[PDB]
Nucleic acid binder design. Structure first.
Lengths: 129, 123, 254
RNA sequence: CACCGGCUAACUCCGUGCCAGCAGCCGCGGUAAUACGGAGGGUGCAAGCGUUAAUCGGAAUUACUGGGCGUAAAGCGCACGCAGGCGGUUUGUUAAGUCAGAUGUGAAAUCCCCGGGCUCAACCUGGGAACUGCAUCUGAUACUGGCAAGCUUGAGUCUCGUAGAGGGGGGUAGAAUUCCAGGUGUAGCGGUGAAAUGCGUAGAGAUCUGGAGGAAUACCGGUGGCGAAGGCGGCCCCCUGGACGAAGACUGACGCUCAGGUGCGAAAGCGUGGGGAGCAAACAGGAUUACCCUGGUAGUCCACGCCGUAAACGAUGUCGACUUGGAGGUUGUGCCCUUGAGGCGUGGCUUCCGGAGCUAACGCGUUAAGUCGACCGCCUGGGGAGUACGGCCGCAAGGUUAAAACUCAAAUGAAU
């Protein structure tokens, strides 16, 4: 059955980018919304919207520069079968700093650079290049 | 494959088998010659190679090769053997050290003398 | 059609050495053919009695270079005649051997076991499947009628294996050499051999079921209990001596 | 001191003639050998230089970092299911995991950094860093866990129908083969390349009439349908399992996978008792130079037990989500006008092409071998070997779990 919705959201984004879609939709949740906000601030997607009351659905708008998907590679790191946690001076860097890593700390969901700035560690969610 | 399967059963390394069991992790061994004879090689090769049957101090009994041209081995000769197999002679995995114990050096050698126990030509 | 003769010289040294034909014994080697098996008979026997069914071979066989006048040639089928006739002619049991088509090699030994004393020992080369059954014993899958009947007459000993690549147009099967030599005395004599064949044939015709009904067409449970034969064991478990026990009983009684 | 064919830095002459010999691998040597033995010249190390033994590397060749399973080694024959692993969404609380700070400890030596002393170096030595660990206090609350209360989209229940060789039991019908009893009738029939065994004057073979018994269901029939797989085919009744569709109501995470365990499982084979028309291992005969012909037993059939294996194959584990199209088949249903096989839709199962992508290639391609997540099974050069010894199971045949010594430098897949 469905046992990991974060990976499902990432796969929807990846498959939509590969097929030149304009937008993607999925069932919503708080964690998904937080991840979407972090993605938007770094300029990987255009915008996100949530609508619905009893069954909210989250709608994302994808982004292309010039006949090219801007999200080169998105990958899930800590899964239900194996969870990954890192201390502050072990947080990884993606493409030697050109990419981002989504980290869940005690103060919310941020990127690796923001966590390093705030001096925290946490759980690694995904790598986005 | 899966993490759970590996937790239940770890990866296992294959065990290496030595090629020279009669040496028993010793660089050389001493033995006594039981039979000195001549055998033929396997296909595409033609010769009459010289070998010997030797009984070691640890109880094993093996066949060893005698390199160079000419030798003086007979029955009840005490020799020293080392590792190394002969390719086109099935069942031979040890060489005989020339110039040690009852084995003598090769006559008239001038190149690569130290591999055949030949003293430097006092000439 | 085409037959496949023996060409390799390395193999046919063991056969000659194993027979070791001396002077003063009657050798009756059937089907010389190209004399591929009699040419390595160059230690010679000052005589031999040869049998060949074909006149063309017999005709272009009387001279050779050296053969000429040492052997008497018969041109009748070996399966038909009386070997024992040529037994008081010399006065001793005959020593024979052959390389016949496996196809016809079975009926001859059963035509030769009847004449008994006129025969001293044999050395034939047969198929490997068949050789194993001949020397086989109880409780295996190579145990059968052939084993029981042959073991009742003579002793079976394999002599030599021939790997398939020794013959020209080599087949898909392997050949072998066995040494059989008739017993001096019967360990278990039977009045009528045909009744023994009848019992073994019936028992091994239903080889896979218990003898309470495999062999119950003639016997009864309490009878077999009388002779100490378990009525719940398959035919392949019955020893030759036991098979001679009910062979004797079926004639002793009705 | 070792080396000078390639790997690998460094080349010529003489001798020998598949001999003598060399060799880590591939190999060299049968009359001009840069590969064997000597000499001249050269290359690499140097008070040392080579050989042998042993460990890691190269080896991503046990793969946590970091591999695979359609055809190369590798998906259990199929299902149910306990322990275990994993688990939709909202609010509150807790603070176990997790994160942050501090304190105690982590012997000295050694390894690393900056210095100092032996004429230099090896060596000796001062100070620091490190010792990635453990424990205890104080905090943080995003994520996982515990506890409490909810939600309806996952999973189930109810109402009405549809199609189907799905399963168990009992009846019955019509064609055909064999046998029996009657009619008409006279001399061959059967078989083969040709004959023979065989049947017949006690009337065969042929043709019509009546009966007995056993096994299987022509046409429909489909590339069609149903079943977890093995598999399921005349017609009628009784008992019974699943799938699918319409509208509405209800419960409220009740879920997925599954080592040991339990069940089902073609044909052949076995035990106890029946039955026996056709066919037919073995067997008994007749021929011709394998294969053929005439008889014919076990068996094939039924009731009840055992056996537990197949190229049991889509050579493709089960569950869920996402990703351009085109031709067919089969089976439901909503709406309009209505001669409707008339138009507009909406579901389930199934066959063939082919796009991106993937693949060693062949090829797969929304029923994936594409992009991902959860759990399970299995693989590690070829032969020896699915073998031996031991355990468990079986009436037996045998099934299942499962090595090593030794031996070779290959064995293999797709395409040209």
């Amino acid at each position: 059955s469905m046992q990991d919705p974060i990976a499902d959201m990432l796969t929807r984004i990846r498959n939509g980018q590969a097929a030149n879609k304009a937008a993607v939709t999925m069932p919503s949740s708080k964690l998904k919304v937080a991840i979407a906000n972090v993605l938007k601030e770094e300029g990987f997607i255009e915008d996100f919207k949530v609508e619905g009351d009893t069954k909210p659905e989250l709608e994302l708008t994808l982004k292309y520069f010039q006949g090219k998907a801007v999200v080169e590679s998105i990958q899930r790191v800590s899964r239900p079968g194996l969870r990954i946690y890192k201390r502050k001076d072990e947080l990884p860097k993606v493409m030697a700093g050109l990419g981002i890593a989504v980290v869940s700390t005690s103060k919310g969901v941020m990127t690796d650079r923001a966590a390093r700035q705030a001096g925290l560690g946490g759980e690694i969610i995904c790598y986005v290049a | 494959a899966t993490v759970n399967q590996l937790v239940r059963k770890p990866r296992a390394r294959k065990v290496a088998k030595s090629n020279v069991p009669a040496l028993e992790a010793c660089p050389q061994k001493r033995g006594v010659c039981t039979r000195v004879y001549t055998t033929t090689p396997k296909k595409p090769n033609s010769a009459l190679r010289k070998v010997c049957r030797v009984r070691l101090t640890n109880g094993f009994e093996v066949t060893s090769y005698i390199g160079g041209e000419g030798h003086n081995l007979q029955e009840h000769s005490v020799i020293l053997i080392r590792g190394g197999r002969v390719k086109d002679l099935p069942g031979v995995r040890y060489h005989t050290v020339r110039g040690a114990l009852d084995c003598s050096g090769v006559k008239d050698r001038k190149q690569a003398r130290s591999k055949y126990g030949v003293k430097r030509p006092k000439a | 059609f085409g037959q496949n003769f023996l060409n390799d010289q390395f193999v046919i040294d063991s056969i000659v050495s194993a027979i070791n034909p001396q002077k003063g014994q009657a050798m009756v080697e059937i089907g010389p053919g190209l004399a591929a098996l009699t040419e390595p008979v160059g230690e010679r026997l000052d005589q031999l009695t040869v049998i060949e069914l074909d006149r063309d071979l017999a005709a272009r066989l009387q001279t050779h270079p050296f053969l000429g006048p040492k052997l008497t040639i018969y041109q009748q089928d070996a399966m038909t005649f009386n070997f024992g006739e040529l037994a008081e002619k010399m006065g001793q049991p005959l020593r024979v051997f052959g390389n016949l088509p496996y196809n016809i090699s079975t009926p001859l030994m059963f035509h030769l076991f009847s004449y008994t004393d006129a025969i001293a020992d044999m050395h034939f080369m047969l198929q490997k499947e068949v050789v194993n059954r001949l020397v086989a014993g109880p409780n295996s899958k190579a145990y059968g009628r052939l084993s029981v009947m042959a073991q009742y007459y003579c002793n079976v000993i394999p002599v030599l294996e021939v790997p398939p690549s020794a013959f020209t147009p080599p087949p898909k099967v392997d050949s072998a050499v066995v040494r059989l030599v008739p017993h001096a005395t019967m360990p278990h004599p039977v009045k009528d051999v045909r009744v023994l064949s009848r019992i073994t044939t019936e028992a091994f015709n239903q080889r896979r079921k218990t003898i309470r009904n495999s062999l119950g067409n003639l016997f009864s449970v309490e009878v077999l209990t009388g002779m100490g034969i378990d009525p719940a064991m398959r035919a392949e478990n019955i020893s030759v001596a036991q098979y001679c026990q009910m062979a004797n009983y079926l004639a002793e009684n009705a």
